[model samples]
Target: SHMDPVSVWGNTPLATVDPEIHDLIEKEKRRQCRGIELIASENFTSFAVIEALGSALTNKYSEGMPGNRYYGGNEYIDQIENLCRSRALQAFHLDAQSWGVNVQPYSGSPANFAAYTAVLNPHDRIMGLDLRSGGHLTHGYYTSGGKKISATSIYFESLPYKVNSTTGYIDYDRLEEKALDFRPKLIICGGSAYPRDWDYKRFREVADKCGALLLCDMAHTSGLVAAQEVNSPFEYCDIVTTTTHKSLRGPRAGMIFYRKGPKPPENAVYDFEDKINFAVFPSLQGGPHNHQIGALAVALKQAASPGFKAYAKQVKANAVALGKYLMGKGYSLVTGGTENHLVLWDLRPLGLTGNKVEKLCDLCNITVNKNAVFGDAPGGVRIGAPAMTSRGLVEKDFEQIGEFLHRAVTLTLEIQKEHGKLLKDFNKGLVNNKAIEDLKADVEKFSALFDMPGFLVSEMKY
Candidate 1:
């Protein structure tokens, strides 16, 4: 009886034990159900994936590879990890003999750093797209004043390539010139906010010319890749890295895929397996999160199905519809339009700031992210379709979303006009704004028409 409370530690429910945290989580769930989530890097995971993530596997501490663990009691853990690895390969349509997958690397940044660590020594030269031109921070970025912004840029010598000033597209000519001159050890492709498809062939050619290993961070479009709705980077890339969430609709984790078999053309040797695997395990992370691995396995299984393929296709279609609707309303989109699941709206042409527009959208219960656009101080807003698509929204639904977004921007401009264009003054004006409150009510009503995927809003209290 003295130790009864400790014995039942795992039996206590979160609501009973920590109502403060539980209530906050419930409030977030209600917010999600009541709002439009258009943030490009966010998604709604399947209930099955969430179930696995919240399972008992979190109690384990398997520090090494499957059978080769640093601890005991890992027999089942090994099974799940191996299943996750295989499912990852299958999801990408890779031959297990030729490609090896590491389902560790806590998240996308770590996954990328692990890949760089595996291939390059400290201070080795690397190249990636410029952050202002839609590249991720992990791809390496440095300031004009010579301060490094990312760990990747700090530990390694980095030179970033930029998009064409007028076109808003990767300037391959400049990239080739820069790579030939800089001669980095690793060249990274893919980006966070670019709405167009990548030219993997051009990247491969540049890498080949400079003898640099090519890596594609397909984090944003892995779901579309799995469904074959986008061009495959595998044909040209020596390695690929991705976050398991986003358009994949999985748990928040990352995966690394490396070339395992013989190199092509000359059939030379390719030995990324041992290097990448060791980097992920003993070099970087301590123990793999078994629960995340299990959840990723579930998400991968879903990705390999026809239904998921259909969903991915619709995600792109919805993005296109939304982009078209916005452009028709006189919004200037980066690269003109999108071939993927997101759209980057360049707000300079419309005389709007992303910060003001983003805040206005938030007030109206429509979520979006402010992102840097090339050649502009007034950055753009990144809008995505995955989360709403998971909730069964389609092309027409996104068109209505585009209308809501346009209205939000119009209201933002109006408030700026009346408030003299200072951020503080504008925000002060929004404090008791009747128009914003009315728009918020309308947004809530519109969002409620769609069913949420992972949970029910009706069952939630408060």
Candidate 2:
């Protein structure tokens, strides 16, 4: 689509095949290269990972593990899967003999659901970080925004937990008390918008005391975990799951890991490793995407590199500085800070809606998602630094973004209060033409400078 003289696709232009969709694809690429992405669950994959995803392996249908496939001709597929699994362990410093990995789940949601299915019976009570409190849907939040629990709640019961309203941090004591009282069969320890490190040890203690198998979804923190930039769930949890796309810089896929618990530490019967492996295979899915598997293998390789560690550390550094910038500006943040890859930017005190802030940010060439700080109500923006940071944004970059956003949002809020709606071009469009168009221009300059991580001439400038 780039239409360069000597291109990767080599004269067989995408525009010739389908100019309509080709236009859309090129449009997206242009926007991606121009806008600043702050969505917590997003990141850029290396060219190798993208190449593997767009490879011929997608043509094959490998329904089962390495050699134990339901179909014939999976010899090469087996090696790719084996490599991905092994490198996953190595990236996280897990012993080959002590851990199990399943890279087949289509994405984070399914991977988490599969893990839940592995250990619990129908209607077996499960506990997880509440969605309102920064948790993912598959971890028992109702798939629809309809109810507080899962729509699958007809088959399974879900008990959700949250962070303290005052401190904006998870209260382990309360969670433990609730667990002992409810006795859920599974306890999930990760969340979607949380910006703090978890007390995996404390979570383990609660699960052990409550007779629950722990499932830690580190999808947002997998890259940091890979680089040891954040705490790992490996030491305390029975099962851990992560998405390769978020921080791992892989293709859009999910992974499930079963730590060799050796045994269920004084809990009920059944080892989770076997159950998780079974749950992922015939129980939840048929053939795995060999192409995605290949990309994941390459992704694991990148995650294990020393340079990747530097990138991971940079991710956190950028987030911390951004958090401080917003906090200093009087923007209420969940926990009033960040320690991980994302922050729940509380805009309620600013007398603005998260949904409103989101659209305004988009107009400014900044992209962030609206997230409920503690519930379904629009409360804050979930700002992440991974994707932009990967594109070579630093602490200073986010700081400038912080001020720009406050100004834009503040101006929009006034327009909103006056007109009871946003203008997109407020008050005849000029605090000297500042209709977020100015912000967009600023973002474009930086965006073009950073370039795409996997692009030919677009090298990352640290």
Candidate 3:
């Protein structure tokens, strides 16, 4: 039961009303307080953000855009939304006159769907990075009805691309060749587990040559883009979508951005800005959460700060250091290492399974996800810096993590080899095993020194 510096409900707390919910909150708080979270798509949010999520704005139903709502009494709702829109552009170094943003869509999946509905009709071809090679499921990777490639594929034809097997990086020449051959209507350029920086310049060329409009999903790297710590998608992409959480470190929501480019040619297809707004508002969703917009405004303000730029730089630095350390200990990396916050460890050669390592690391109080890599029978484990970096983990700290990974992985392998037949049953006791308990103790002791960022801002002296 942590006290809000000033509670919206005053001294009457959840501890008094809903003891069950409060207990679950405490359970999650303890889990996070004691663990090393490295999930690629997760990050800690500020209390200011949490405050907005719990605010009274959720009580209203503003069923349309700002200033022109479908309902009355939306004056403050419009004000907050307008504020968020301006800050959203400022956060990305984009001009309000040139770029339009929608701070609705619930989350990233719906955001992507809205973008699709904006541009393509049913049966139009679309391309994205392959899921088995680090792409998102929304990018037309998963199957639907055990027939179509995905839900998106059921309506539109989907062509997924992959990284080179040898280099473990995007083969630009091959990608371009495929683009020329397939001629998709929309091409997506980002992936959830890709650990390398994109060649957006080359992608622009491919899109132009193929007459495909590009929609880059920057959900994974929006914070880096806001900090200008990485290349901006606005330079090459016509439309962009990102989640407010993850690297942006905001509330759980999604945003859509589209720009007014140069004078349209004779065959100008759709009004980019209006298309996206209409698609999200009437075509796809109903009401925009004004509370989310308000919190997004706060996050966008924070993202534009000098501190965020420094943090973004440190995130990449920590990933590089950790990746190098892991490689030195005989672990292989996709793209050899990372130029971004994520590191895709190639554990297949070691005869290890991603699911096993995922459980083992969790047993040791280090959280990560099992991910599919290109052609591996069992996929690899993916680790990222954003969440841990948000906790103030530096390069040297990841070095310790790298060593911990090696130790836990080595111990799990030894145990599995000794009891290969009983591995499944033995793994049930995995978290409580003597060796894993020792590792958990070390991890708990280690993480207590660093405060979780944003939420714990006041816990330690800045």
Candidate 4:
């Protein structure tokens, strides 16, 4: 029997080979079917994309760029990578001559790192939107105590620009002033939590003044950009990086696109192509995951479809609907309204923080993430429409979701009053709370009506 486990070429299915992982995946599916997903950086990729991820293509390792490999037997792998590159460019409406793409970075963070490593030397100055202001770590980050938090920050000197605390919008004027003073080699725009569209034109001006290369990490809203539902950053930026998942509705992977062609006048050359490709291959990563590239190719094909455009439009509408409903109920939405697929709710106005509110949300079968707000006054909760909208939930459904969230927050406050302000005590109070139990039952019932993207609810045993 032990010999059979090793000598039969491992043809057993997942359930037969290891029931633990299969069962956990099934349980997770049930949990997803039973709850509302509102985390802004998550999505349900298409079945075709999932199938591509699971394909035999993953068995091969393509260690370098197409037509130039560290190993042989990449004939078909080369074609898949090339298609993924072309489709990635096409999805964003870019001409091949002007844009070059590297689809090899494993995920968004590594993609950002590869881009940085390609352009700048160690300790070269770089600036990005502040993390607390909705920016991501790969843009470079650190604590007030000068503790380096990300590799980008450790290897390079970094600073962050923040939003206007009063209005919750990117303080562009201040950012410009800071960029001039700091004189960074690169200025990153795009963030993880901000709810508004980027002003690429203004960012370009700032970069020009500082002589900084502009990079837009459109990781959170690449789908909207693909659908032309939001402003395009390609016209202004020198480089763009994005995760294939999140708003792009693909498997978890990353892409880096750089300016390729010569500029007008003297036809100044753009040299990012070779540097970034080298960085992703030899400097940062070894082999590109063929399966992730394959899945991304499929997702990019889907992103170019008319139906995906409609889906992108609805994601924004649903966010607006949810924000409006919450505002009508006296909840404070960061930026006062959403111009994208997410809304950041400052729970302090309701005598709560995201830490407590998100826990309450979990108890009630709703998923939201605690996030830092602009002013840093106790964090807030960020919710998005991508996942639920993937489940075919509409604006009205989002409005109902607003109602469910409001109820959860209200119950959290009540629970805090009974259990005090400590998180540990608050958690204990949730164990037998009838209000939470009732909301969980209602939330499950509502979630049951929606269709999951990859699996059928009817097949879920629990």
Q: Pick the candidate with the highest lDDT.
A: 4
Residue pairs of candidate 4 with colliding backbone atoms: none
Query: Candidate 3 residues 1-462, lDDT tens each?
Result: 976655545657787767788888766776776788989888998887888878888888998888778999988888888889888999899977678888888889889999999899988999989888788878886443456656777778888888887788887888898889999999999889998888898998999999999889999988888888788888888899999899888888899999875534565543787888889989989888778878888888888889999989988899899999999998888778898888999888888888888988987788989887762345699998998888888999999989889988888787677667255754655644787888889998997878865455244212
State how far residue 222 of model 3 sits from its true place (Å).
1.0
- Each prediction's Cα lDDT score? 0.91, 0.82, 0.84, 0.92
lDDT per residue (tens digit) for residues 1-462 in model 2: 656665445646677757788778767777777778888888978888888998889889998788788888888999999999999899999987678899999888778888878878888998888878888777776645656556535568887888887788897888999999999988889988898999999998899898888889999999999999888898888889989899999988889998663464365433666788788888998889889999999999999999999999999999999888877877778787888998888888777777777876777778899888754448788899899888888889889767777776776686677656444544433345455666778777767777576655433221
Candidate 4 lDDT, 335-403, residue by residue in tens: 999999899998777778788998889888799999888746456999999999999999899999999
In order of appearance, the predictions have TM-scores of 0.98, 0.90, 0.92, 0.97
> Can you rank all candidates by lDDT, best first?
4, 1, 3, 2
Regions more than 4 Å wrong, model 3? 1-12, 142-146, 264-270, 375-377, 421-432, 454-462
Q: Show pairs that collide, candidate 1.
A: none
In candidate 1, what residue range of length 10 has the lowest lDDT sum?
A: 1-10
Question: Model 2 TM-score?
Answer: 0.90
| lDDT by residue for model 1 (337-414), tens | 999999999998777778988988998889999988873445689999999999999989999999899889888888
What shift in Å separates residue 121 of candidate 2 from its native position after superposition? 1.3
Residue 339, model 4, lDDT: 92
Decide which is better by TM-score, 1 or 3.
1
Off by over 4 Å in 1: 4-8
Q: Model 2 RMSD to the real structure?
A: 4.8
- Return whichever of 1 and 2 wins on TM-score: 1
